[PDB]
Structure formats: C-alpha cells, structure tokens
Design a protein around this nucleic acid. Structure first.
Length: 190
RNA sequence: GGUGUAGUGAAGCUACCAAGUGACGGAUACUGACUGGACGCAUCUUAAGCCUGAAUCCGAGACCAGGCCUACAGCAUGCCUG
C-alpha cells in the first residue's frame, strides 16, 4: 500500500524564520542560526504560511517508513526551532562513592577534563563540539554539576553522552560501583 | 709423518655466547550510546540521521621488490646525435 499523500506539519513561532530549499533547512532565531541538510531523503519539506507559518514535510506515494520519516524530519525541525528560541541545556550530575571526580574545563571552552574518576591515574579528556558551551556550576547551586548548553540538541546531547561514555566503569559489578557523570535533566535555557 | 703435536695467536667469520634496533593512523565488528519516529508514550535504528572505535581489515604509518595505455620501456635531467 502506497498512500497517495502524507503530510506532517510543524507550526513555526513568530520571530523565527525557517528557510528550506533543496531539503537544506536553515533556521534563524534570537538565539542564533542552525542548518541541517536532510538530503538523505526525497521528500518535499516546504514552508507554507504567511500569517501563521508551518513547515510541512510531504511524501507522495510513500510507505509507512516514509510516513514515519516525515514525522522524524518535522521533529528535527521542531528541535531546531527550540534550539533557536529557548536553547537546550543538559545538566549532568556527578556520582561517586569514594573518589571525588574532579572535572575541569580547559583553557578554551573545549576539552572537559575528568581526573580521579575512580582513583584511576588516567585522565579523561573530552573535547566538546564547537557550538556547545560546558560550564561547571558553583557548589552553592548544586555541587558536582556540569551543564552543557547550546542551540543544537544533537551537539549538546552528544557532548553529554561523550562525557558519560568517558566516565564508564570496567571490570566491576556495575550494580555496585555506581560512579559516573549522569544526565540529570534535559532542560531549556529559555 | 697428507696440518707431527701441545701454548698463545692477529685478521676474518661468527654467537641472545657479544652489540644494537623494532612509535602508530584510518575504515570498521560485537557492542555501548545520542537525536528520533513508526506506535501522541517509549525506543541505539529489529527505520532514516548521528557518536565512539577491537591484537581482525587497510595504510610508504614504518618497511621489501619494482615499470602502470599519462607507461611495449613513463617523469626530470647531462652529453652525443639526427
């Protein structure tokens, strides 16, 4: 079965403009600008409003995988809208039983550093993507807390996952030894 | 007495019996994840899209031999010759 038509729409807020051409979606906004070349697919991806604008992704004679990938493209564009309007901010909380994980953002913005993870003398260097700021929160607000804020949910969440996978536990029962840096919340910078 | 026979014996050969020399990179596997639908949720993807990156594979990364219709004798170049 091939549906003659399927469309998924994403309402665009005011103050944000979503340009799209050749399936290269560019999104402007107060927090900045994003681009995404969703050219690995062959769908319509237009913006079709004057008063209240919407990004509509359409597929003509597609299959259920197309009716699903339309929604995932629309969701990516909605996350770009969020990243340019309110921004993304992932808060990672440190967890350690005996050895204080000492985290240090390097000279530039990049390169989070993890030392004394589980007593190990290794040092975990995680050089963050450009487009995402990592800042260590002061212990008054919340001790043992890093926050990664940006305009690209992909970049921010992948930096969070990179810090996570840098602080992993090997050769031990991971039901015990629960140490690591864990994403405590996926918030917005608003 | 086919080097008569003990001692030392240079040179050469030679010995983990002496002396030295032998960092790694990339694409990836099983995974483990991120964004994320289908399936209002959730889901690593048993879907697109992405992250990592195994002694295996690939690498002048180091190495060994060399002739490829740009080459049945190719590039540069010295001199002789047409």
């Amino acid at each position: 079965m091939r549906a003659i038509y399927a469309v998924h729409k994403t309402p665009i807020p005011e103050g944000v403009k979503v340009f799209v051409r050749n399936r290269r979606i560019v999104v402007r906004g107060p927090r900045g600008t994003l681009k995404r070349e969703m050219r690995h697919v062959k769908y319509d991806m237009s913006v079709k409003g004057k008063k209240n604008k919407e990004f509509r992704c359409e597929v003509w004679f597609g299959k259920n995988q197309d009716e699903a990938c339309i929604k995932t493209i629309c969701s990516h564009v909605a996350n770009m809208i969020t990243g340019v309007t309110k921004g993304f901010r992932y808060k990672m909380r440190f967890a350690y039983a005996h050895f204080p994980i000492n985290v240090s953002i390097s000279d530039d913005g990049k390169a989070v550093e993890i030392r004394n993870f589980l007593g190990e003398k290794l040092i975990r260097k995680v050089e963050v993507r450009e487009g995402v700021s990592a800042s260590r929160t002061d212990p008054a607000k919340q001790k043992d807390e890093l926050v990664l804020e940006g305009n690209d949910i992909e970049k921010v969440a992948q930096c969070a996952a990179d810090i996570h996978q840098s602080c992993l536990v090997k050769n031990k029962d991971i039901r015990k030894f629960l140490d690591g840096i864990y994403v405590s919340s996926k918030e917005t910078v608003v």
